[PDB]
Structure formats: C-alpha cells, structure tokens
C-alpha cells in the first residue's frame, strides 16, 4: 500500500483485482494536482508489454502472471515518478473499467530524511466540566507523509467520536523535503473524570525494510509502531 | 486531409411491388477512415440481421461495403439507409427512391 | 484479368487491431482467411485451382505464420516508425493475364512501400519513413525470398488453374432485367425519368434512352453497383421539359441477351 | 484528439443538500461513453455512473448527469448529498466501439497545543487543532 525508494534503484508493485475478470490490464498514475494517465497496459495471452506515446522504452514492466496477483516493476526511478499506482482492468460486459486498489510510492535523493513520527497526548483545557473533555495526540517529525493511526483505549479498538485530520500537514513547507504532522482530536465526563480509564493512542509508521542499506548515525526508520500512554486525574 | 466520406446508394434488387419480397441494398463507397456505422431503416427503426460483404478496397485504397436485407414493401411503408462516420457531423440518411 | 490478395491492418486503439485478408479475382472474390481456425476458406468448389491438397496446406501455414508475425511487428515498431494511433495499414499482391507479378502497401491511405524485382522500394513521395520502413523490411533476406518465390511462381501457375476451373462460372451469362420509374426533379417544369437495371452478368453493359432510333445524348449513366448474388445493377436518367417525354423509350443491350434489346416506354401517368 | 477538464478545484456545501461538479470534453468521435468515478483519501477508486453519446439521461441510482452534447458539456448532479460521500472526484472519457484507456479531469475535492472546539491543522463539533 505503501513503498518509499531511493533514486536509481528499482520497485515493484504488487496490485489486486477483484478474483478475475481479466482480458487486458492497463496502469495508471496518479499525482496530485495533475491528471492520471495511462503508462502501458499487459497483453497476458501474448505477454505484450507496449508503453504508451513518449514514455521511455524499458522503464517499466509487467510479468505477474496471475488475475489477482500482479506485479509491475519501475526501474531507474527519479524524484519525479513517483505518486499512487493503479491496475485496472474492463468488465465483462466492458460497461466499467474497475480499477485496483493503489500503492503510493515516494521517492528521494538519499535515504535519510524519513525518520518515525512522534507521537505523545497533550493537556487540553483546564474548563472541562466546566460536561465534555477532549484529549488529542499529534505525529509529527515523520515523512513520507504516510502513516496510520488509531487510539486504542482500555485495549480495544476505537470506532466512532473521533475525526482524525485527513491530510498530514507539513511542519517547514518551505523545503519540500521535511516531515508533517496530523492530529487525531477525540470523550464523556465521566470516562476521563474516572482515574482508571487509560488512552493508548498508536501511530503505525510506513518506512524502510530489512533489505534496505542504513548510513545514518540515527535508527533505521523500518516500519514501526509508536504509542503513547495516558491517564486521568479526579480533580 | 486524409479523411474521406462515403458514398452511399440505395437500390432494389427487383422492381418494388407490394407484397412480393424483395432485396434492398446500400452501398457505402470512398472512405479512408475505414470505420463506420451502416444502419438500415424501416419507418424510422433499425432494421436487425442486416448482412454484409467482406470488407475490401478499390485502386486508391478506398474502402467499400456492400450491406443488403430481404424484405416485403407495403405502400404506407418507406425505408432509408443511415450512416454514421468518422468524416460525418451527423448521420447521413439516403432514402429509398421508390418512383 | 488478374488475381490478387488484399491484407487490411486496422489499429484502430493500442488493444484494437483487426486484420482482414481476402483473395480476389478482380471484382469477386474467392477467398477469405480465418484466424480463429488459421485455415484458408474457399469461397467456391473451384476457388482451390490446379493446386494440391498438399501445398495448400504448406502455404496456409505459411500465411498464418505470417500474417501472425507481420500483425505483431507493428505495435513493436508504432513508436520507431512514428505510426501515430489510429492508422490503418493496406497490401495488395497478384499477378495479371498472359504476367506481371506487383505488390504494395498503403499507409494511411497513401502509398508507403512498394517490393519490386526481390527488394522492398520507397515511393518517392512517402518520405523518409517509407526508406526506414523499407530498411526494417529489407533486413531479413529469407522473407523477401520467400515473398518474391510467391509473386514470380505460384501466383501465375496458380492463377492458370483458377481461371481453368472457373470457366463454367466466369462465362456464364445472367440475363438483366429493367423497370422504370420516376426520378427528382432537376428544376421546375421538368421531369427525370429513370431507367433501372438489374440483375445482369457480366459487367458489360448497353444502356441508354431513344426516341425511335435517335439515341438522346442527355442520358446520364450511372455507376455499376453489386447485388452479392454476383449480378450488377445500373441506373440511367434523362431530363425532359415537363413534355414531349411520352414518346421516350430505354433500351438496353447486354451480351445474355443474344441479340434482342429490352425495350421499355415511358406512360406517364 | 481529446481532452478532458474540469474547473472547481476544492468546493464546500452544506449538509444534506444538493451540489454538481460539471466536466468540458473536446473530443472527435460519435460513439463513446463518459464516466465519473470517486477517489476516496485512501486512494481507493470506484465507478459511480455511465452515460455517453446517444444514451438519454443516467440517473443509476441517486445521481443524475445533466447532459448537453450539442454544447460538449456533462455535470454530475447528486442530490440527497450525504455527508459520508465527501472524496475527490474524476471526470473519464472513453470509445465505445473499442474501450481502451480512459482520460482524466485533474479532479473536484469535495469537504503545548490548544484547540478551539508551530501548526494550521484542518477542521473535522469541531475538532481542529
């Protein structure tokens, strides 16, 4: 769902399609601001690979041969192609073309600059009562801007009263190379007035693998899982 | 500039009479886009198992089809030949001239 | 006079090619190709000739592996040659009476390429693109012999066969049959009278409006168009003002008719 | 010989109401169908509706398109708006006779620390922060 990579060395992305239904696949890309277009599309009963207009010859393939398990590789990549990947494929009746699910990949210069989030619960206002309380906790100082994040209280899921900030805003959006953050605002009277209810708020941190080369002096930034821990108080 | 229209005729088999059957036939001629809607009409709606001829070309690599229908002409009914094309702003109707 | 195989690649998308190849002796035709069965369809009992049960085979292998391989090379080469989506591809290939062997191809429509004597030769028209496209089919040297052994040998002793055989076919005579009919007017206080023919092979044809034995020169003779029984059709008209029109008559002549012209007045009314 | 756009960039209405998204076509073919499609945060993709050419008015199910062909102009009209459909929105275009890629509007999107229920944070009662 998520892959980050450095440039000049290769990707491959892994995309799934409902069973299969499958002629014909085509992939498409996606960028923000700009339009998807199509990058070529696999001929499986002839393992035709052709690209499309003025893409350059040979800097992606397609081999997965299989309707829902299908794999495209990219190689040589830039600072440039890099966004949300898409498989597609027509219907049956070619009435809808139903497209897959998508892998976002980023790319950058060397392989620092993604570090794991930060993740801790702050103090909200002292009012409170004075019949509701809102604790929030904020990840910042991680890119790529791509990570999840739940709250976890008393060892159980959260489902509902909780909006969390869709887009990860960037803490320096001068350089485009710095990390972002989201908050996750989320609580009767009661529950936080009662000092044994607990908040475990967890950021799951997409990053590196063990294949990967580390050079930095700090930690490798694999993906993670960071959480905090929180209380309440009776006055 | 290399787009060109098609020609179109409309033409009985037979002399028309009604309640004798007979074959009406439209002639789609001169077109190098190569990829057209050939449609025959009885009373305005489209007529079904309309057969055709194998597609060719002529000496300027024009394309021609020959698309024909048997069929019995009653006097309150008329007949007409659509085509649909590239080269076309909308589709061209050749009517049967039945005297 | 001469026999001729035609091939249609139509790219009308990236994932939409339809390839259409069809044997034709002038203006009928006799053959057709299945690439569901890969198998050549004889359109006729005679449209198999003098030739083998055996090499028909050889060469409906070496056509499918052919037309397979040449239907594949494009979309490899769309970019290289700067074949700009949609375009159309055509071929034409035979050999006449008597014995001149030709084949050529059409690029949107105009002529690209042409195979003279045992090469692949530009037309000087087409451009640069024709010579990179003669250069990519002048590379392998077995096609272009296997090509020229096609035009200069199996297509006269083929052709000899066909015509052979179709002799019963090709010399038949069908006799025409005319109505005729009212026509639009070309202006006002005039009439058009129309004069069809139908139903006639072969194509040669005698068709035109008299008054007694006076050919009137203001007949307009129309094209000769199919019927897919074989027989043609033919629509002659002539204009008149309004009057001195019911002493017109059509006559045609036609080598079925053994010598007795059909002969039909106009009423009227 | 076809492109496709769409004007609105981000838009905003009120709950339970109705709002459209309109979609500029040039394209240079008579048979062909034009779809929508919704872009959800999680990049997820799904089609919405299919109409095109000679095809009367589409109204699959809560959601009717305002076609004018003479003018080459489709809008994507949805009523009944529930606050749960906000996502970005894609505008598609495709032949009919041989489907084959499609081409794409560039998109509508739809809508210590102390909070007013260095950073700008977003609104989601309120929640921003």
């Known amino acids: ?235 | 500039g290399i787009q060109r229209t098609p020609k179109i005729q409309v033409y009985s088999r037979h002399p028309a009479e009604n309640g004798k059957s007979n074959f009406l036939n439209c002639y789609v001629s001169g077109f190098h886009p190569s990829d057209i809607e050939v449609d025959l009409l009885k009373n305005g709606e489209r007529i079904e198992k309309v057969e055709h001829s194998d597609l060719s070309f002529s000496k300027d690599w024009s394309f021609y089809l020959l698309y024909y229908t048997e069929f019995t002409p009653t006097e309150k009914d008329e007949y007409a030949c659509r085509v649909n094309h590239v080269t076309l702003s909308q589709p061209k109707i050749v009517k049967w001239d039945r005297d | 006079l001469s026999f001729h195989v035609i091939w249609i690649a139509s790219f009308y998308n990236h994932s939409w090619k339809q390839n259409l190849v069809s044997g034709w002796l002038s203006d009928l035709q006799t053959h057709t190709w299945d690439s569901n069965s890969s198998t050549i369809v004889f359109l006729w009992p005679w449209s198999r000739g003098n030739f083998s049960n055996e090499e028909w085979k050889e060469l409906e292998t070496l056509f499918r592996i052919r037309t397979i391989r040449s239907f594949e090379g494009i979309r490899r080469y769309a970019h290289e040659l700067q074949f700009e989506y949609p375009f159309e591809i055509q071929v034409t290939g035979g050999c006449e009476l008597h014995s001149g062997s030709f084949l050529q191809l059409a690029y949107q429509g105009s002529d690209f390429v042409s195979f003279q004597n045992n090469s692949w030769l530009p037309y000087p028209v087409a451009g640069n693109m024709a010579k990179h496209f003669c250069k990519v089919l002048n590379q392998n040297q077995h096609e272009n012999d296997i090509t020229h052994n096609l035009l200069s040998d199996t297509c006269p002793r083929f052709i000899l066969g066909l015509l052979d055989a179709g002799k019963a076919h090709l010399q038949r005579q069908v006799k025409p049959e005319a109505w005729l009919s009212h026509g639009p007017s070309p202006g006002p206080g005039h009439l058009q009278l129309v004069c069809h023919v139908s139903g006639f092979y072969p194509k040669p044809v005698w068709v035109m409006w008299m008054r007694g034995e006076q050919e009137q020169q203001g007949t307009q003779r129309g094209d000769i168009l199919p019927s897919a029984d074989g027989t043609w059709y033919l629509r002659a008209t002539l204009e008149v003002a309004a009057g001195e029109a019911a002493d017109l008559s059509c006559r045609v002549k036609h080598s079925s008719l053994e010598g007795q012209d059909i002969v039909l007045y106009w009423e009227g009314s | 010989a076809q492109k496709v756009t769409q004007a609105q960039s981000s838009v905003s209405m009120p709950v339970r109401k109705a709002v459209t998204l309109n979609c500029l076509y040039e394209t240079s073919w008579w048979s062909y169908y034009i779809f929508w499609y919704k872009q959800l945060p999680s990049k997820e993709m799904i089609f919405l509706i299919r109409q095109g050419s000679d095809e009367q008015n589409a109204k699959s199910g809560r959601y009717s398109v305002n076609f004018k062909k003479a003018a080459k102009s489709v809008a994507l009209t949805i009523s009944a708006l529930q606050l749960e459909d906000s996502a970005k929105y894609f505008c598609a275009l495709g032949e009919l006779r041989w489907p084959d890629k499609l081409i794409f509007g560039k998109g509508t999107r739809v809508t210590s620390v102390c909070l007013f229920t260095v950073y700008i944070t977003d609104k989601c009662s309120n929640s921003a922060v």
Not at chain 1, 60 to 74: A, C, E, P, Q, V
Not at chain 1, 140 to 156: I, M, Q, R
Request: hydrophobic share 30%; charged share 20%.
């Open chain 1, 1 to 235: 769902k998520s892959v980050i990579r450095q440039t000049g060395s290769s990707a491959e992305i892994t995309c799934d399609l409902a069973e299969g239904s499958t002629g014909y696949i085509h992939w498409y890309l996606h960028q923000e601001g700009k339009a998807p277009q199509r990058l070529l599309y696999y001929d499986s009963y002839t393992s035709s690979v052709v690209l499309e207009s003025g893409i350059s010859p040979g800097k992606y393939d397609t081999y997965g041969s299989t309707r829902k398990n299908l794999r495209m590789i990219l190689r040589n990549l830039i600072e440039n192609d890099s966004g949300v990947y898409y498989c597609a494929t027509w219907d049956g009746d070619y009435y809808k073309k139903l497209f897959g699910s998508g892998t976002t990949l980023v790319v950058t210069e060397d392989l620092k600059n993604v570090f794991p989030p930060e993740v801790a619960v702050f103090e909200p206002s002292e009012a409170e009562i004075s019949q509701k309380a809102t604790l929030v906790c904020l990840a910042t100082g991680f890119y790529p801007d791509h990570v999840e994040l739940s709250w976890w209280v008393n060892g159980k899921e959260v489902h509902s009263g909780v909006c969390t900030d869709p887009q990860p805003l960037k803490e320096q959006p001068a350089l485009n190379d710095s990390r972002y953050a989201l908050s996750s605002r989320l609580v009767s009277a009661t529950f936080w007035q009662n000092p044994r209810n607990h908040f475990r708020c967890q950021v799951q941190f997409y990053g590196l693998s063990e294949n990967d080369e580390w050079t930095q002096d700090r930690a490798k930034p694999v993906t993670q899982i960071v959480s905090a821990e929180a209380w309440g108080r009776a006055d």
